[PDB]
Design an enzyme around this catalytic site. Sequence first.
Site, short mmCIF file in Angstrom:
data_model
loop_
_atom_site.label_atom_id
_atom_site.label_comp_id
_atom_site.label_asym_id
_atom_site.label_seq_id
_atom_site.Cartn_x
_atom_site.Cartn_y
_atom_site.Cartn_z
N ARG A 131 2.65 29.96 3.12
CA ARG A 131 1.77 30.66 2.15
C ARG A 131 2.06 30.08 0.78
O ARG A 131 3.12 29.50 0.55
CB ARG A 131 1.99 32.20 2.12
CG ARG A 131 1.42 32.98 3.31
CD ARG A 131 1.59 34.50 3.19
NE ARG A 131 3.01 34.87 3.14
CZ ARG A 131 3.66 35.69 3.98
NH1 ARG A 131 3.04 36.31 5.00
NH2 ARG A 131 4.96 35.91 3.78
N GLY A 132 1.11 30.23 -0.14
CA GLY A 132 1.35 29.89 -1.52
C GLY A 132 0.55 30.72 -2.49
O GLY A 132 0.15 31.84 -2.19
N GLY A 133 0.35 30.15 -3.67
CA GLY A 133 -0.49 30.74 -4.69
C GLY A 133 -1.94 30.78 -4.26
O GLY A 133 -2.60 31.80 -4.39
N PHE A 134 -2.45 29.69 -3.70
CA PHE A 134 -3.87 29.58 -3.53
C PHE A 134 -4.39 29.83 -2.13
O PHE A 134 -5.60 29.97 -1.94
CB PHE A 134 -4.30 28.23 -4.04
CG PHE A 134 -3.89 28.03 -5.46
CD1 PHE A 134 -4.63 28.61 -6.47
CD2 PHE A 134 -2.74 27.36 -5.77
CE1 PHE A 134 -4.25 28.47 -7.79
CE2 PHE A 134 -2.35 27.21 -7.08
CZ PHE A 134 -3.11 27.76 -8.09
N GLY A 135 -3.50 29.93 -1.17
CA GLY A 135 -3.90 30.25 0.20
C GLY A 135 -2.79 30.01 1.19
O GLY A 135 -1.61 30.03 0.85
N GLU A 136 -3.17 29.79 2.43
CA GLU A 136 -2.22 29.76 3.51
C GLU A 136 -2.37 28.46 4.28
O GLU A 136 -3.36 27.76 4.15
CB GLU A 136 -2.44 30.98 4.40
CG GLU A 136 -2.49 32.28 3.60
CD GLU A 136 -2.15 33.52 4.41
OE1 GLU A 136 -2.66 33.66 5.55
OE2 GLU A 136 -1.38 34.39 3.91
N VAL A 137 -1.35 28.13 5.07
CA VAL A 137 -1.39 26.96 5.91
C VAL A 137 -1.22 27.39 7.34
O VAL A 137 -0.33 28.19 7.64
CB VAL A 137 -0.24 26.03 5.58
CG1 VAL A 137 -0.33 24.75 6.41
CG2 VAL A 137 -0.27 25.74 4.09
N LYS A 140 -4.53 23.58 5.77
CA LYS A 140 -4.25 24.29 4.54
C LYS A 140 -5.56 24.83 3.96
O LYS A 140 -6.44 24.05 3.61
CB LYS A 140 -3.54 23.36 3.56
CG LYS A 140 -3.12 24.04 2.29
CD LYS A 140 -3.10 23.09 1.11
CE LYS A 140 -1.82 22.29 1.03
NZ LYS A 140 -1.36 22.30 -0.39
N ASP A 188 7.02 16.47 -8.21
CA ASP A 188 7.44 17.84 -7.90
C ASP A 188 8.44 17.83 -6.76
O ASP A 188 8.50 18.76 -5.96
CB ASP A 188 6.20 18.67 -7.50
CG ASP A 188 6.45 20.18 -7.46
OD1 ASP A 188 7.50 20.69 -7.96
OD2 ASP A 188 5.56 20.86 -6.93
C1 LIG Z 1 4.88 22.46 1.04
C2 LIG Z 1 4.63 23.88 0.56
C3 LIG Z 1 3.88 24.93 1.34
C4 LIG Z 1 3.34 24.59 2.69
O1 LIG Z 1 3.80 25.26 3.62
N1 LIG Z 1 2.53 23.53 2.79
C5 LIG Z 1 2.29 22.80 3.92
C6 LIG Z 1 1.57 21.61 3.75
C7 LIG Z 1 1.27 20.80 4.84
C8 LIG Z 1 1.70 21.15 6.12
N2 LIG Z 1 1.60 20.63 7.35
N3 LIG Z 1 2.25 21.41 8.35
C9 LIG Z 1 2.76 22.46 7.68
C10 LIG Z 1 2.43 22.30 6.30
C11 LIG Z 1 2.73 23.13 5.21
C12 LIG Z 1 3.72 26.30 0.79
C13 LIG Z 1 2.40 26.46 0.07
C14 LIG Z 1 1.26 26.81 0.80
C15 LIG Z 1 0.03 27.00 0.17
C16 LIG Z 1 -0.10 26.84 -1.21
F1 LIG Z 1 -1.29 27.03 -1.82
C17 LIG Z 1 1.00 26.49 -1.98
C18 LIG Z 1 0.84 26.35 -3.48
O2 LIG Z 1 -0.12 25.70 -3.89
N4 LIG Z 1 1.71 26.99 -4.30
C19 LIG Z 1 1.61 27.06 -5.77
C20 LIG Z 1 2.76 27.82 -6.48
C21 LIG Z 1 2.30 28.94 -7.43
C22 LIG Z 1 1.84 28.62 -8.73
C23 LIG Z 1 1.77 27.17 -9.19
C24 LIG Z 1 1.43 29.63 -9.61
C25 LIG Z 1 1.47 30.97 -9.23
C26 LIG Z 1 1.93 31.31 -7.96
C27 LIG Z 1 2.34 30.31 -7.06
C28 LIG Z 1 2.83 30.78 -5.71
C29 LIG Z 1 2.25 26.31 -1.33
N5 LIG Z 1 4.83 26.57 -0.15
C30 LIG Z 1 5.44 25.57 -0.82
O3 LIG Z 1 6.31 25.87 -1.68
N6 LIG Z 1 5.19 24.26 -0.59
#
Ligand SMILES: CC1=C(C(=O)Nc2ccc3[nH]ncc3c2)[C@H](c2ccc(F)c(C(=O)NCCc3c(C)cccc3C)c2)NC(=O)N1
Lengths: 58, 339, 623
Positions: C170-176, C191, C288
């Site tokens: 999961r993250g800020g903008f959605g889920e994977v 994603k 990053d």
């Molecule tokens: C690598 C990663 C995530 C993630 O799991 N990504 C991912 C990508 C490709 C993949 N292939 N197989 C599994 C897989 C997983 C996961 C994630 C998932 C979805 C997302 F949208 C994001 C993300 O964009 N986070 C932004 C951080 C953030 C900001 C900048 C502002 C306010 C709040 C938040 C949480 C992050 N968390 C993370 O820390 N990093």
Amino acid sequence: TASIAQARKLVEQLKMEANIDRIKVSKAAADLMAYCEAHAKEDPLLTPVPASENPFRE
Amino acid sequence: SELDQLRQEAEQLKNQIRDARKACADATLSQITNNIDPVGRIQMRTRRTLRGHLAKIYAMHWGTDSRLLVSASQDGKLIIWDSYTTNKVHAIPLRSSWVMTCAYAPSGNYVACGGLDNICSIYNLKTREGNVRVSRELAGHTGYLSCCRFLDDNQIVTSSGDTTCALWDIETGQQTTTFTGHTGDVMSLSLAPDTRLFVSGACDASAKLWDVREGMCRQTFTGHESDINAICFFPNGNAFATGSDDATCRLFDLRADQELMTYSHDNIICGITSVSFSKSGRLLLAGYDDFNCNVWDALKADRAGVLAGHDNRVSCLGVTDDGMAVATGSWDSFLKIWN
Amino acid sequence: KKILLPEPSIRSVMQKYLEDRGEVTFEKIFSQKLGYLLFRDFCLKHLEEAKPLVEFYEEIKKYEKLETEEERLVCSREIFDTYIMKELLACSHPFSKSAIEHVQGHLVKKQVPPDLFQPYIEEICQNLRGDVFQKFIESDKFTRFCQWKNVELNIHLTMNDFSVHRIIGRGGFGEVYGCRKADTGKMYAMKCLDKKRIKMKQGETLALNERIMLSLVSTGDCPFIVCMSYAFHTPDKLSFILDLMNGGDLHYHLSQHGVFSEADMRFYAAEIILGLEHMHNRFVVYRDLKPANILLDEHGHVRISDLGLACDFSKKKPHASVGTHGYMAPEVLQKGVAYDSSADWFSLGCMLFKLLRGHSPFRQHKTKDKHEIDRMTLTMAVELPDSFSPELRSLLEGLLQRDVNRRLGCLGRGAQEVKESPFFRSLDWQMVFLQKYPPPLIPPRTKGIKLLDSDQELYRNFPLTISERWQQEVAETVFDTINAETDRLEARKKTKNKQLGHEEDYALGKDCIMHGYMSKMGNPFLTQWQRRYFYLFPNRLEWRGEGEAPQSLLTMEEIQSVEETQIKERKCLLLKIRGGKQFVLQCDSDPELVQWKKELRDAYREAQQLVQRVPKMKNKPRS
Ligand SMILES: CC1=C(C(=O)Nc2ccc3[nH]ncc3c2)[C@H](c2ccc(F)c(C(=O)NCCc3c(C)cccc3C)c2)NC(=O)N1
Ligand SMILES: [Mg+2]
């Protein structure tokens, strides 16, 4: 147009066209009228024919 | 200057020809034929309609058997029809879609056609194999093929937008003779019945009489105000008629070397695509861009009839050697047979 | 469900569609997996001249991949003996003296690098481009190519094309999610990012950027980056289809296992480096880098993921403070100051330090203050603990150089510099790349926002297929069985043509410009689509239903304009006809639409140009 040879050709052509034997229109006319008369018998469109001898009715 | 002189001299000779002609204008054909009875009701009717072409029809020609005919169409085919039955004897898929013209050979062994490919393709009808194949691709014109008529099964005359006409040896594929003189696209030709002469009508508004066997122009007839789109021999071979975009037909007499008769009416504004005489020449039929064929009295000039069974332009027509019938072909995709 | 090739008729349009784009060159077909795949099946089986050539290419291909020198010793001789020596002895060896020499000369010196036969590669190609290629083109194998390519260029994806499964991030903008692409069954990650949740946090760039980045990095099948095969959206969501990593991230595993031994850390860095190298070679900085962007696959091998904050520099250079606090370089944090590759290497050190020590190097006494870390990094070389080995110590020093001018992996050979640290002394980098090292850790088993036209326009060019990734996907899944199945369907219908006797081909021996199915409106009143076989000619467009020849047509003269129109949210052609009348055409695929539009357009223009110079054909005035 500015080609000397084409102007020559043109001229020889008009010479050939000029020195022909012409007949009076009156006779030329008569000759067509004559032909027309001499062949109006044989002209299916000039005389409506009997359907019998007309390949397009039956 | 020699060029300047040759220009004057052509000019004198044009005038000399004009006066030579007026010296024969002792009477008019109209005058001469004031006596003879009118021709009366020429009411002809669609006997057959020929359905098959998918697009406009550009041209047609009757077989000498007064039964078969080829027509050429925007659909890119020739159809050889048996007009008695309306059966497609042959449908010929052309190699170029831009066909404009076509001709049935006297024997009925071949047809010809061509158009924007600048080629007179000779199709052969009977092999021992029983097939319709391109026997020759007569090439040499540098412009569209506009008309072509077989002299026999081995010589054929063509006309073309390259302003020239030509005579070919089929067997060899050679352009054995070239007829030059016209200054605009040549649109139509007609063979004399003896076939030692032919006339051609052109976009220069002049028509010309040519000797097949000598390669030259004998006579040049003018008077039309626009393109001559079609031309036909009077059946005795001393006169021809032209049709033009100026909305008139005219009869020109060879031996008098001049126009005898304009066929026109103020009602008719549209141009003529095609002309043909009845067997005795008494009737002059013309196709028009108003969709009708008008039947004219060759001798009196009275309009005498109207073929009115097409929705677009009448693009071509023809009378059978036997006299019986009249094809009209049209931009509406059909041929109608009439008598 | 599964992929369905078009009939071989499709060749007419595609060949033209591709010709127009310049894609029927040997270069451009041969470098596509499916292109290659077909081109060979053609050489190997259907031409005596090219069998040996490809066979030779392939053997050199297999040779390049051999790991032992003692194996390359063996194969080089065999290859030399079979494809070089023998053909020489019958004068049917058509390659430059230069190539033969290069190999022979090496064999007696017994020097067997993997690029031994690179000079033959270039030249086998030389032989195959040309007559061999043009015959390929003529063959049914190029038909097969067009068929497959037709599929490719008409990919439109929807969640529906995928079978979504568990959530893996999961993250800020959605889920994977983990998912499988129905078509072919290939496992992927999906994603999803909610566009609302985006507009909300104003992260329209991060998304848009992650896409462009993914699209730069995803060629090359890098095993150390979570690359992307596709991207599509719905009006609600953004979708990235990515490499599937089901072992979670390092940041989590650090927690669970605790700090890493040096040897364990050597593994992660090795692989991470190769990832960086990959990007850096495509002028992209990850910016990053940290444990949480290092995902583990099922087996413990890792990949760099989530190019959100990554950044291209193949032209202009970044300067902004971007990255996570604790890993950003000085020249990163220092606003104004431009930069490139450099930062990742810095973060790299920060990151590795963290895996050894449990916290970033610029984070003593478990401070949680952003401003506190920032400034220390700006100017304070790091306390490197008693326990650290010199090889490590050296490596960190090198990486965590605050001076970029003397920073390990910043001196004009990038990655290579770092691979040479004594820290990695003991590693064979091909083995790292082949993922042959044992990994230490094996993983265990609300708004009121609205969505305007001006929002959706931002994601207009978001959709995308990566050709490489799709062809690879296909190549290894269904390409072979689909080819048989289709082969069978075609050669069946060759027979039901031959019995029924329609065995003449209506498009041959004339001037047909192009043909293939399209659909039109049959009934004006009813408005449904009949699929018909059309044939474009210079002066008319003819069509036909089965059996019968064409019994209708348009003339290019009738046609006044050709335009796109929507009908039931489907892109269609709208021909306007002379009377005021209209005519509407639906095509089976995007390229078919692009081509019919282009060619209809071209032909009507031509035709009217041409007709206008033909007194017997032209229109005359009427009143
Ligand atoms: C690598 C990663 C995530 C993630 O799991 N990504 C991912 C990508 C490709 C993949 N292939 N197989 C599994 C897989 C997983 C996961 C994630 C998932 C979805 C997302 F949208 C994001 C993300 O964009 N986070 C932004 C951080 C953030 C900001 C900048 C502002 C306010 C709040 C938040 C949480 C992050 N968390 C993370 O820390 N990093
Ligand atoms: Mg900066």
